[PDB]
Design a protein around this ligand. Structure first.
Ligand SMILES: [Cl-]
Ligand SMILES: [Cl-]
Ligand SMILES: [Cl-]
Ligand SMILES: [Cl-]
Lengths: 179, 180, 183, 179, 179, 178
């Protein structure tokens, strides 16, 4: 589970949040720790597509919360839109916080489920700043559903310094590493 | 909190209308979750809703394919209000829509407390194939500020006991089936 | 002059009518120069929702910091600066107001409540059919007058608010029809 | 502010108005200049959803003015219909004049408030010709409420030629630029 | 199952095909009769998303057959794209031929399966002319998956003149009825 | 060489684990791999040819994906026009490849160049690369070059190839299964 590592990376990712921003939060067990770490006095607007992520936003007294609806999928408790992403097409989030099961220089960022790709792809195209929040265990892993190339992300946040391969790759692509 | 026993009986009767593989719409409130709980746990069905407690009840049904209408979250009745285009809901023509109402009045119609619930209630009233209002005996004669529509918009009104003769006569004249 | 005395009579009736507003109620305000004084007299700390169909009524609601204001749109008409709804399903059919506050140019025991403009009857009749409590707010000069547009029988109003008690025939009619007179 | 630039762009947009047309005017401080530029002898029907826009139409002696009613929102003094589906039924404007706080090739046209999206989306679905009227400062900006892709607009009107990025996108997508 | 009626409506729909057009064919047992009715000498490009439709196109010597890929669903043997936003982004068919289980004046065109809506919605958004081909039994029926309002279709083709309420709706909405 | 192809295909099928995401190349060898997978093993598969898809369609526990595009009669394949629609969404656990030639110098080759865009996609995105060829493919040189043999982690055949291939496989750390 690496809960302690996820919580530390998420706390560092939360330092990027500014008052009145519109934020996108991906699914999984890492992003809810970002929501918890945001000071409860900071007002913000948030969009999400998973039950545990929404329930975390619901506990923030100054969060204007939006949920992308659709068919419920038990894995990661997500909602998958039938086709058009009406709710999401109304936003250009200041920051999108992403989750991934794998981070690979050649293969890119991957996840376990294809059902999560439509919303992750929407965020990658419509958000203004892309922040991948992943514990150290995700580096070097490759899962079967592909989100995209690592160059799609502006910042990668983790619990400790990634291997030298990712440090050098991040320098070349101007990807900021926070750990 | 109050009239749970009555809400349970109305829900029990409403659940008998469900048939296998139907697409069902469930309104917000504390009555409709009891309908979902009363449905045969072995019957497969597809359900559409727009509120958190309604969705959580559908999630507990092993053979329910559940859809949630998204949008802005409103604390009252824990609903989701679409910004404008009802994308998820525009994909459905439910076999049965189960509605909630704070008031049932012969001339003013069915009413609720919150205007934010009217867009999805009006959608169901235009797109569902059968309209079933599920209300306890206390809703009859009450009028709240947000108007859902005329009682002739419903095919069936389900309650825990027979309403006053005023509603029996009205339902008989309008061809509205009363179930209690 | 006669203009200033008319405003203070309307303001006195409107100030008394404002005492009926309770927190979180949904209110309807009619058109004219009496209803804006009701809106102004409501405690600025009381939250409420209000629907109207005229520009001056809307502008008065806009000044209330805790008023959730709704304006019935449509085509604009110069007299009383009203909006004629094309479709009542747009805004008005969504409401069953807790209280409807009405204006009238005439109040008569047999001819009923009347106004000058037939164009205002569609919205006035809508409110009379859908609101939960009906409050007619009129200065004393309106009693006994009969204008061409008929709103309805005086018995359709739960409360009639004026700047002074009307003549005995109105007091007796109110007792027979269970109309509360406020003055 | 840029009042002179807004007036010059709006004056150019007004040249598209023909007698007896039905026009939609968006909210903001640019569209009132289009209304001012229309010849006073030209009769037309107009629909709007904001107080300042309506007051400008009321001042036009040969304008049959319609106001889209609903809940009042102080920002831009707009009215938001209770039910988007019942917005201005049976109105099919010949031209819709739109406002935007941001014009971006990838993110599209954006505005500051989500409460303005329902009537803007109504016009985008019902109007026969879509004209975006924006001063040069809107180009490159991305605001939190998204109206739609720039290809949703038939014409983009401005006070001067925008950067080559926009001239190129308009040329490839066949979007007319007027300046 | 009115196969002769489906074949008659399909033959009439086939008269709209012109050489070198790009055509979309919906799933079901009505559209394959349109494909059979097209002269085997007429060259054309076909887009489909179902196995039986594809196998019918594969036999047309001058047809360039394109298959919309994705996840296979046994009902109607269709393919559902992983991400609707990336579906056939380069095609703008001259004509889209649609299927429907229900044709209703108020509720619109409906089908039985939600998995068919993404490609049906893609065609409705990208094709230049929309032609619904339905036998007389579809009129008045309502199924649970909604494709859209009847006004989304330019032409409705059937095996006989439908009931007066459909003739009136079509006249008012400018929908051409072919039978 | 149906018996030889089934022999090699059956050996290749022993590599499949439940719940894996697999890529199956075109040709008449890969459908025999699909046939050999136990019908009770659940798996997800992506392909780009008609016969390969029809083979997946017969597996009751296979979640089947077909990469679309323009149909091409030879090897009955689909030529993708947009890699973003289906293929770029996958990083398969195992890619099972076909080839008409296996040569130390010329590498793995096929007859049709229309197959290279999808084969090259698989070679770059799959996690494990398994070339399944009967003994007759060794030493042949066809006109469409897939890539050097070192790009494949495993080469599955129906019998031991000539010593030149055994030694080359050892120097490249390629596993030979036969
Ligand atoms: Cl009057
Ligand atoms: Cl709102
Ligand atoms: Cl595809
Ligand atoms: Cl190399």
């Amino acid at each position: 589970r690496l809960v302690e590592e996820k919580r530390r990376a998420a706390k560092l990712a939360a330092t990027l949040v500014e008052p009145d921003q519109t934020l996108f939060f991906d699914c999984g067990t890492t992003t809810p720790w970002i929501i918890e770490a945001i000071d409860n006095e900071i007002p913000f607007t948030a969009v999400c597509y998973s039950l545990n992520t929404f329930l975390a936003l619901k506990e923030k007294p100054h969060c204007r919360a939006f949920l992308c609806g659709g068919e419920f999928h038990a894995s990661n408790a997500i909602f998958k839109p039938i086709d058009f992403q009406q709710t999401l097409n109304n936003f250009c989030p200041d920051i999108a916080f992403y989750s991934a099961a794998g981070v690979h220089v050649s293969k890119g960022a991957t996840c376990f489920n294809l059902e999560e790709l439509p919303v992750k792809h929407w965020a990658m195209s419509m958000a203004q700043k892309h922040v991948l929040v992943v514990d150290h265990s995700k580096f070097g892993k490759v899962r079967p559903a592909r989100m995209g190339d690592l160059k799609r992300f502006d910042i990668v946040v983790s619990d400790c310094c990634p291997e030298d391969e990712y440090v050098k790759y991040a320098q070349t692509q101007r990807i900021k590493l926070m750990y």
